[PDB]
Amino acid sequence: SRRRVVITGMGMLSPLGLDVPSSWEGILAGRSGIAPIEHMDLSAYSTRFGGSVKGFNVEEYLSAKEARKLDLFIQYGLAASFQAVRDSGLEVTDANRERIGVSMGSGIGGLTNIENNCRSLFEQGPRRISPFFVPGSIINMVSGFLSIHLGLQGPNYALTTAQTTGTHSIGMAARNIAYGEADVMVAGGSEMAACGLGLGGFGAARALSTRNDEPTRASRPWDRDRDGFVLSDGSGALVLEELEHARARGARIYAELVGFGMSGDAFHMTAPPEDGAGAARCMKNALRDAGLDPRQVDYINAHGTSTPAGDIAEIAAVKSVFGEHAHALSMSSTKSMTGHLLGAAGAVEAIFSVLALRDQVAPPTINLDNPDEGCDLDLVAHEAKPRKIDVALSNSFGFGGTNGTLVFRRFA
Amino acid sequence: SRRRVVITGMGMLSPLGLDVPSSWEGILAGRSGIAPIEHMDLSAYSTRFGGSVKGFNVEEYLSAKEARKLDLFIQYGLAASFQAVRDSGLEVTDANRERIGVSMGSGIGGLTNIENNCRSLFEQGPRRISPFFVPGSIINMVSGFLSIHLGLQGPNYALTTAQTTGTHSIGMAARNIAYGEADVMVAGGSEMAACGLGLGGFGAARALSTRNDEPTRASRPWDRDRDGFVLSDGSGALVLEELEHARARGARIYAELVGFGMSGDAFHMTAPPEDGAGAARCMKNALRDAGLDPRQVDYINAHGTSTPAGDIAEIAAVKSVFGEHAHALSMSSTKSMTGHLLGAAGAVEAIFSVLALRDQVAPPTINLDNPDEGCDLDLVAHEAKPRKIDVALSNSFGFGGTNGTLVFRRFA
Numbered sequence: 001s002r003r004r005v006v007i008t009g010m011g012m013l014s015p016l017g018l019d020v021p022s023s024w025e026g027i028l029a030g031r032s033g034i035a036p037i038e039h040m041d042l043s044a045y046s047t048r049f050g051g052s053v054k055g056f057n058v059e060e061y062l063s064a065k066e067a068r069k070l071d072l073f074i075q076y077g078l079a080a081s082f083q084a085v086r087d088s089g090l091e092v093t094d095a096n097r098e099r100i101g102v103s104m105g106s107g108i109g110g111l112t113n114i115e116n117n118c119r120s121l122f123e124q125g126p127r128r129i130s131p132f133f134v135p136g137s138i139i140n141m142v143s144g145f146l147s148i149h150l151g152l153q154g155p156n157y158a159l160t161t162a163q164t165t166g167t168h169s170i171g172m173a174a175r176n177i178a179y180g181e182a183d184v185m186v187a188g189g190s191e192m193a194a195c196g197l198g199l200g201g202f203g204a205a206r207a208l209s210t211r212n213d214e215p216t217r218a219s220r221p222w223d224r225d226r227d228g229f230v231l232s233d234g235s236g237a238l239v240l241e242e243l244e245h246a247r248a249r250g251a252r253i254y255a256e257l258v259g260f261g262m263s264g265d266a267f268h269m270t271a272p273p274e275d276g277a278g279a280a281r282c283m284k285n286a287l288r289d290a291g292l293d294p295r296q297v298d299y300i301n302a303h304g305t306s307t308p309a310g311d312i313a314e315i316a317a318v319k320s321v322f323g324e325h326a327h328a329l330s331m332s333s334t335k336s337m338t339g340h341l342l343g344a345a346g347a348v349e350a351i352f353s354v355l356a357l358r359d360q361v362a363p364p365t366i367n368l369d370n371p372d373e374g375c376d377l378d379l380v381a382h383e384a385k386p387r388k389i390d391v392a393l394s395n396s397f398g399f400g401g402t403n404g405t406l407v408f409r410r411f412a
Numbered sequence: 413s414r415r416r417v418v419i420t421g422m423g424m425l426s427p428l429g430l431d432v433p434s435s436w437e438g439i440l441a442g443r444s445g446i447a448p449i450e451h452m453d454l455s456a457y458s459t460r461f462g463g464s465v466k467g468f469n470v471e472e473y474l475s476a477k478e479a480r481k482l483d484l485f486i487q488y489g490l491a492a493s494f495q496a497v498r499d500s501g502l503e504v505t506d507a508n509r510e511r512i513g514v515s516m517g518s519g520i521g522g523l524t525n526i527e528n529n530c531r532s533l534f535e536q537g538p539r540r541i542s543p544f545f546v547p548g549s550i551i552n553m554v555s556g557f558l559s560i561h562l563g564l565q566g567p568n569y570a571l572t573t574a575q576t577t578g579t580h581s582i583g584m585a586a587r588n589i590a591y592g593e594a595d596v597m598v599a600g601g602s603e604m605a606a607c608g609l610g611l612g613g614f615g616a617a618r619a620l621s622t623r624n625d626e627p628t629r630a631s632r633p634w635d636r637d638r639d640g641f642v643l644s645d646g647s648g649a650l651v652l653e654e655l656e657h658a659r660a661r662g663a664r665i666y667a668e669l670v671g672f673g674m675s676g677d678a679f680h681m682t683a684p685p686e687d688g689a690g691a692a693r694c695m696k697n698a699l700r701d702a703g704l705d706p707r708q709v710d711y712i713n714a715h716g717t718s719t720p721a722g723d724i725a726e727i728a729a730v731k732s733v734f735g736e737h738a739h740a741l742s743m744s745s746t747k748s749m750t751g752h753l754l755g756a757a758g759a760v761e762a763i764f765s766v767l768a769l770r771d772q773v774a775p776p777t778i779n780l781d782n783p784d785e786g787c788d789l790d791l792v793a794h795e796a797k798p799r800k801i802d803v804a805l806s807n808s809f810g811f812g813g814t815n816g817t818l819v820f821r822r823f824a
């Protein structure tokens with residue numbers, strides 16, 4: 001029968017820092033990680049800024065010889081995974097290696113690498129494609145390379161559900177443990193889509209903020225002057241562990257994962273329905289899964305992408321799920337500061353949701369100068385809000401009408 | 413306790429045919445779907461052949477306008493999925509749509525789209541990138557488009573575990589139903605990596621057969637003259653359904669899905685361990701999941717890719733798991749005929765495993781002229797073998813050392 005699941009380890013690369021503590025300090029201080037992009041020439045692009053990981057040293061984790069073969073999204077996924085496993089204190093042994101698995105996902109995966117090999121192919125010929133093109137680019141190789149480096153022989157897989165990837169990855173990994181398929185899972189996501197095709201492709205869809213002259217103010221969830229999401233890079237990883245397994249080894253437990261919801265909108269390939277019907281169905285699934293009264297929800301880490309339709313849909317969904325209690329909880333978008341890490345969004349935001357529980361503070365939605373029509377909830381505008389948080393919820397919505405909700409609570 | 417899961421609908425595009433019955437007819441006749449790749453300059457490539465889908469008409473499924481928005485791998489996934497849902501007779505209603513979900517995956521995703529948008533980007537700059545580039549290329553859009561078209565509001569996700577994708581998708585969809593998160597799931601995979609990038613990428617790793625003079629003899633699993641896998645395109649979709657749900661509406665039930673196993677090799681990025689230790693753990697996990705003794709297995713659809721190390725690892729794993737029963741079962745690689753559909757391999761091979769149960773026949777391993785050292789199992793060389801089959805396994809072993817096994821049983 002269904003086992004309980006706790007968080008014993010966390011790891012992160014974000015536009016705010018090269019680990020969890022440094023990222024979280026930036027979150028609580030309302031600091032933006034968004035800046036003009038330096039790694040390529042974007043003069044022909046309508047968007048020239050994003051959330052870059054600054055000063056990442058892969059040789060903190062891997063040999064330069066191995067790193068050369070891997071896309072940045074794999075390098076970032078391994079770094080966050082390595083941090084989370086170390087943070088857990090867990091020792092991998094012959095006695096437990098078959099019971100530890102990994103589910104690290106990505107929305108787009110190795111687009112930089114595929115673009116660079118596509119350039120080699122077109123300009124030179126197929127004989128210049130890297131021998132490592134496939135294993136260095138395809139999305140399942142975070143899970144693959146992590147298992148090879150740590151000796152994890154448990155369930156080994158990868159989700160790809162666009163902007164919902166990190167949330168689904170964590171939820172489904174919790175279900176693996178819940179149902180006895182594993183005792184430990186390393187789960188989350190990673191993304192590095194800041195190449196020509198990434199910035200160009202989201203640009204062609206007119207999905208991105210074009211506030212090139214003020215990048216720190218571009219990401220402005222629920223602000224009436226928002227004009228699209230900000231593209232950001234990085235990784236989140238959590239060590240999920242069966243409760244009795246955690247208790248037995250004396251693990252430090254950050255929080256319990258009590259609820260997971262998924263729902264499809266079945267509405268539109270790219271647009272969320274204005275009323276948030278799919279997001280509402282997903283949160284209600286997650287709250288029922290957790291055995292909660294919705295009035296127990298203290299904090300919501302919103303998807304909050306800073307799109308016109310997405311941000312208002314989320315207000316509508318929260319009002320419909322929580323009714324009068326919608327006015328008592330706090331809801332913030334850390335994407336105000338980090339931008340949109342796409343497949344990694346749900347992973348870093350799950351970490352921010354757990355840290356909201358550890359520290360009893362709602363992170364701010366920075367840049368919320370003029371809340372839009374109907375955006376009249378506690379959106380923690382401008383400044384972190386210390387407050388009682390027993391139950392935190394983290395939402396993600398994605399292309400294909402794909403929704404995920406995670407429910408965390410304090411563990412005593 | 414756990415709900416029972418049955419197969420009530422199947423759909424396919426393969427190198428043998430544009431549906432299940434035409435593909436299966438080719439399989440039992442020992443026909444090859446492999447041929448030189450057309451309408452593509454492969455002059456500078458060491459491999460010039462593969463398994464193409466021949467005569468696919470997307471306008472049987474989509475308007476020209478919707479099909480223009482979608483990579484071939486998505487078109488193929490949608491074709492298989494629509495076929496599977498039609499084949500099932502299922503009526504989607506307001507009363508059941510929240511209980512019907514989708515998990516259609518891909519190993520490599522939108523390489524053909526990425527290739528064509530790279531052309532535009534390099535030649536003319538980013539403003540010629542298609543608006544639909546991102547939603548038209550990301551792996552979760554088969555699940556996304558299918559859910560939107562049919563109004564499916566159940567779990568909506570996509571796996572990407574390289575050559576294991578189709579097996580994991582079906583297995584994890586079966587878990588969703590067994591543990592009551594859904595009553596119906598459309599599950600499987602789709603793949604179209606016959607671009608410069610797939611042929612070039614696998615070619616750079618010298619992973620492909622280069623037998624250009626005799627494409628139909630290239631894929632020769634367990635034959636001493638094999639020289640790597642054959643790249644193939646297509647899709648498989650299954651309608652998975654809770655047993656009481658299927659019986660209440662009078663569904664035609666092909667077979668029961670009794671067992672699902674996962675494991676990680678934790679060994680190498682592209683090569684399996686010589687003894688197939690990971691594949692052995694995975695099959696043992698799948699049989700434990702089914703409550704079955706290795707002795708009860710009659711038929712194995714092998715991964716059987718025609719790689720030197722892969723084929724020999726699978727013989728070792730089967731001998732290890734099945735002891736004195738290893739010769740009694742029949743094991744064949746339908747990849748001898750279809751080539752390797754990568755992420756769709758597990759989906760089309762689950763369908764072939766189900767049909768081996770319906771028709772009491774083991775598909776052939778064609779081209780097995782000279783079994784290699786230790787390849788002395790019943791590999792159904794050359795010709796289909798009518799025989800008793802109560803229990804059929806389907807194995808997938810992919811990059812990152814990610815393993816999947818499905819156990820199907822006759823239903824009466």
Ligand SMILES: O=C(NCCc1ccc(O)cc1)c1ccccn1
Nearest residue numbers: 060061082083085086090091092150
């Ligand atoms: O290597 C790292 N972590 C893995 C720890 C580990 C845990 C269990 C085990 O059995 C083996 C290794 C790392 C490196 C730099 C920064 C953070 N973490």
